[PDB]
Structures are given as C-alpha cells and as structure tokens.
Write an enzyme that holds these catalytic residues in place. Structure first.
Site, mmCIF file in Angstrom:
data_model
loop_
_atom_site.group_PDB
_atom_site.id
_atom_site.type_symbol
_atom_site.label_atom_id
_atom_site.label_comp_id
_atom_site.label_asym_id
_atom_site.label_seq_id
_atom_site.Cartn_x
_atom_site.Cartn_y
_atom_site.Cartn_z
ATOM 1 N N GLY A 1 8.600 -4.485 18.153
ATOM 2 C CA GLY A 1 8.250 -5.945 17.941
ATOM 3 C C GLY A 1 7.815 -6.271 16.795
ATOM 4 O O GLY A 1 7.135 -7.400 16.393
ATOM 5 N N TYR B 1 18.635 -9.099 6.143
ATOM 6 C CA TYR B 1 18.430 -7.857 5.646
ATOM 7 C C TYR B 1 18.768 -7.491 4.419
ATOM 8 O O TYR B 1 18.174 -6.740 3.972
ATOM 9 C CB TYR B 1 19.251 -7.053 6.784
ATOM 10 N N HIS C 1 4.209 -1.287 9.709
ATOM 11 C CA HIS C 1 4.904 -1.222 11.059
ATOM 12 C C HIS C 1 3.868 -0.759 12.127
ATOM 13 O O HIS C 1 4.000 0.421 12.342
ATOM 14 C CB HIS C 1 6.049 -0.670 10.980
ATOM 15 N N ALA D 1 6.325 -10.127 12.499
ATOM 16 C CA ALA D 1 6.323 -10.279 11.064
ATOM 17 C C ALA D 1 6.932 -11.903 10.692
ATOM 18 O O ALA D 1 6.200 -12.253 9.723
ATOM 19 C CB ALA D 1 7.160 -9.237 10.495
ATOM 20 N N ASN E 1 12.992 -3.197 -1.110
ATOM 21 C CA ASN E 1 12.781 -1.985 -0.968
ATOM 22 C C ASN E 1 13.371 -1.276 -2.172
ATOM 23 O O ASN E 1 13.090 0.133 -2.516
ATOM 24 C CB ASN E 1 13.424 -1.167 0.114
#
Lengths: 330, 333
Positions: free
Chosen positions: B268, B300, B263, B273, B307
């Site tokens: 943005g 998401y 990031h 991405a 993660n």
C-alpha cells in the site's frame, strides 16, 4: 394474569388427575404466561410427572431467578438438583470416553475428511448462525477462489474472509504446544482477524460505550485480564474440558468487550480450548441456532447448565458423526 | 555487454551528418536515431545524439532529459556534461513559468463560486480518484464498476473480493483525508495521520497489515524503531517552516518520492504516497489531484528518472495533471 394461574389450579387437580389433560392445561398456560413463579412451578412438576427431571429443575431455577425466596420453588429444586447433577456429570463422562475412543487411528483420509471438510463446515456454520445467508458451497467458493458470489453483500464475504484469518492465526499460533500460555493480546488479535475485513475501524479494539439484562460497564480491561489469568491458572486443568470451554465462551460473551464480533470470537475461544484438550472441531450448527441463543439467555439468569448441555450435545454428535464416517468408509 | 551492430552503424551514420541541407534534415536523422533508441535505450552515444536532434527541433526539455540520462548511465561522460551545461538554466526558466501558470490557474479555481453544479462534480471526483489510484496499482475494476460499488453499494460477482475491498478502503482513506486532515485546526501533519490514512487504505483488503509498519542481538537492517524514525524525519521535514517556502507542487512530489523510497509498509506504499501527495496539494488550495491510469507509464518513467537524481520530470508530471484537474472543474462551467 390469573385466568390461567387459576386454570393452573384446574391443572393442579388435573396434575393430580393423571392425564395428558394436565399437560394440555399447562401448555396453553405457558404460551400465555411469562415470568409468573407459580406458573413456572406448576409447569415444573408437570414436567417432572412426565419424567422430565432436568426440564423441571430448569423451570424451578427460572422461578427462583424471577422470585428469590419462593420457598415452594426452593423445596422442589432442593430435591431435583442432585439428580440433575449426576445426570450431567456423566453426560460429560460419556462424551469424554467417546472422545478417547475417537483417538483410534491416524489414516491420511481421516486427515482429509476431518481437517478439510470440517474446516469449511466450521466457517460456514459460525457465520451462518449469526445470520449470514451464504451457503456452504458459496463459503467454500469464497475461501478457495476469492471471487464474488452473486446476490450477496460484500459484508457477508468479508465475515467469511475474516473468520478464515482468525482460524489460521489460532492454528499457527495458539494451537501449538510451545504456546502454553494464552495472552490478552492474543484475544485482541483474534478479534482483529475475525472482524478486520468487515469492520477495520473496530477490529481488535475495546468498545468505548455501554450497550443496552445488561452487560459489564467499561471497567473492561481488568475482566479480560481475569479471563486470561483464569485460563492459565493450573487449577483450571482439573475442570472438565467441555465445561472449561463453555465457561470461557460465557465469560467472554458476558464481558462483551467489543462493539461487534463478540459471539464469533467466543465460539472461537470455545473451539480453541477443547482442541487443546484432544477434541476434534466442535461445530455448533446453524439449524440449532435457536437452542444456542436460548441457552445463552438462561446463562444470563445464572444457570450455565443448559449451555453446557448444548456444547456437550454437539461435540458428542460431532465426534459420533466422524466415527460413522470412518465406519462407512470401512 | 554488446549492442547489436545496427545500433553501431546508426551511430557511425549519424556521427557524419546532421547538417542543414535537404539530403538529411531532422526526421531523416530522427527516424534513424529513434529506431536506434528502440534497440538500445541505455546507450549514451544514442542518447546524446537523440538529444542534439531534440535541441534542434526546439524540444529543449526533452533534449536536456536525454543529456541527463546519458550522464547518469555513464558517470564522467563530459560530452553529456557540457551539453547539459548549456541546457540547464533555460529549462529552469521554462519550469518556473510552468509552475507559475499552474498556480494562477489554481487561483482562478478558488474564485469559482460554489453551486449545485459544482458539488455534483466534487462527489463524482471521489469515484474518479479511487478508480484511477487503484487501477494504477493494477486493480481491474472499471470506473463504472467502481462507481457502482461506492455510490450504489453494489457488488460485481465473479470478480475479485480483494479488488472490492481495495476500492472501499481507498474511498475510506480519501474521506478521512477530506474530513479530518483538511480542517484548519489540524495544521501539522503527524505520523498518525499517515498511519491512519494507511489503516484506511488497507483496512478492508488486508486488515492485519493496515496502519502497521513493516518489521538487534543479531543481524537485521530493518527495525520498527528505525523505520518509525525515518517516518518521523519525513513528517518533521514536512512541518518545518523552511519547507513551506517551496512550491506546493514540488513539496508534494518530494513527499511522494521520500515516502515511496522509505516504503514503511509491507504494501500500500504507492497508494498512500499518492494520497500524501494529494493531501499536501489540497492544503495549498488545489482540488484533488488525479494521476490517471492511462498515464501509468509516464508516472513510472518520471519516477525512474528520480532515481537517477532528477526529480524534475516527476514535478512536471504532477504539475501537468493538477492543471488538468483544475481544468476539469473550470471547463465544466
């Protein structure tokens, strides 16, 4: 054509005939007659007969600019110039003492009136003079609510937004006292915020072509450096603040370093300079657009005095207007 | 700290059942474990049970997903470990053929003969892409409003100026992507390409920050030099030859993931991405990949699992939707 340089002679013994007749003749003359030195000269002394000394002198200067070596122009100007110089010098003296007499008190609503209303006034006028069709209320609406105004192009909104950005940068960086030196990256950043929203590819970037009475070739970074250096030179503190500001505007507009946004950034620089010199915000109002551009034109003929007189006029009328505000608010 | 008791008795009830008769079966067990799920999503026992129920209804990929989450939330949980041990090679097979299917459908997209029915769609796809990618970030402009702004040079009054500028900026970035970054003369993807895309993404909406990286005689964990260097690592990974040997879809997902995690911009990042994802997918012969805003949650959700160490759900996601894209073009003929 000489139909009316001939009648400029009709207006020659009409000029030594003592009449508004002379004036009549010179006015139909001028309306039909552009850059012919004899016509300009005649108009000049006719103006001088009506006790318009600075306007006469202006006529003579234009004649001399179009016709280097015109010795009648030379002998007339040689006489008018020193008078015009005294007059202008305490035009300046007058606006200055009117400034010193502005600084008479700190009241919270002098803050409210001044800062707030003149902020929106500033943005409004600066974009409006360039042709923006937004109103003051609409400009204000854009800055405070950020919604879209009916009937206006996204480009107009964006010019307003950009200006708010530029102003904020100017205030929170270049208008501190710890910021005693004005960099070239600072002018670049001002342009970047000025034009950022409206034209992101060109904002904060030097132009890479020549533009179509010309403007400096792309030697360009050096003159920018020149401007910066001149601003930070100590000698330049001995110059009248107002003339200093005007000269900055003039130098920048003449270098014309960006593809667009040159005028807005120049007025910004002007405003920066006089604010650092203890003056309130200087608003060059949109109603006087014509005068503004007109004087700039004369500046490219070598005469910066009409423009200086312009900036003087409007910083004085500005300060004068504030005082009045206080006086009425009693 | 403490799950509610109802979850606890859900688990004791389900631990003594699940057999093959008519007094339980599937959805008897399932409805219950799902109400449990609804009350305690991160409970490894519930995840494990739900998992085995999935496995019984031939929902292998979902079962495996349950086990992966259970093991991630509870490090060392060997019940999860052995269950996953059974499921993993099967899901690898499944995934590999999914990818093969998407690839053959791409090959039959490129054999479609260009007409004046196609360019219609191609042009409309600009508006479609911009709409979805900004809506996902939270922009409230409509598809119709977006189209009106981009195609008709309209403006929606009473609506946010910032949203307009986001639409316009994205359109700019996308056009740049198509007319500079896809010319075969380009080959390598430079750091300046990503910067230029960001500069166009955020140009109108936030010009001071566009194409600009977020910013040691004191403490600081962030440095222009360090963020720039992480970006360099990313691009170098993208142009290295070894990484050309992996499936374009997976390459794209991993790119997206890496950029989102570094990031390098103040804002943005997500839009850029998705843009990068798309660039990678197009240079491998795919039409633009539209991740629809209707699937925002899934998006998401899959990133959530990334993660936890598992990039497979996300890969499956972008695969699904590039397949739906190609399908959009294919079906319109």
């Amino acid at each position: 054509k000489e139909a009316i340089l001939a009648a400029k002679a009709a207006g020659r013994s009409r000029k030594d005939g003592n009449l508004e007749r002379a004036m009549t003749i010179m006015e139909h003359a001028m309306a039909l007659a552009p850059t012919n030195p004899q016509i300009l000269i005649e108009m000049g002394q006719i103006r001088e007969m009506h006790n318009e000394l600075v306007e006469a002198d202006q006529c003579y200067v234009k004649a001399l600019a179009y016709d280097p070596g015109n010795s009648e122009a030379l002998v007339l100007r040689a006489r008018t110039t020193p008078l015009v110089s005294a007059i202008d010098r305490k035009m300046l003296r007058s606006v200055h003492d009117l400034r010193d007499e502005f600084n008479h008190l700190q009241h919270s609503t002098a803050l409210r009136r001044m800062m707030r209303e003149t902020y929106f006034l500033y943005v409004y006028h600066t974009v409006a003079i360039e042709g923006n069709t937004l109103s003051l209320g609409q400009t204000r609406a854009i800055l405070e609510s950020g919604m879209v105004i009916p009937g206006k192009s996204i480009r107009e909104h964006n010019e307003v937004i950009g200006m708010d950005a530029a102003l904020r940068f100017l205030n929170c960086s270049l208008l501190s006292k710890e910021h005693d030196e004005i960099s070239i990256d600072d002018i670049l950043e001002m342009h970047r915020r000025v034009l950022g929203n409206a034209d992101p590819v060109e904002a904060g970037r030097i132009r890479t072509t020549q533009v179509y009475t010309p403007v400096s070739p792309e030697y360009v970074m050096e003159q920018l450096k020149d401007i910066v250096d001149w601003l930070n030179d100590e000698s330049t503190l001995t110059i009248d603040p107002i003339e200093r500001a005007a000269i900055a505007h003039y130098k920048l507009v003449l270098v014309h370093p960006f593809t667009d946004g040159n005028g807005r950034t120049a007025r910004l620089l002007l405003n920066l300079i006089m604010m650092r010199s203890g003056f309130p915000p200087v608003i060059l109002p949109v109603e006087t657009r014509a005068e503004y551009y007109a004087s700039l034109h004369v500046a490219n003929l070598g005469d910066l005095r009409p423009f200086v007189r312009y900036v003087a006029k409007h910083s004085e009328a500005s300060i004068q207007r504030y005082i009045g505000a206080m006086k009425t608010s009693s």
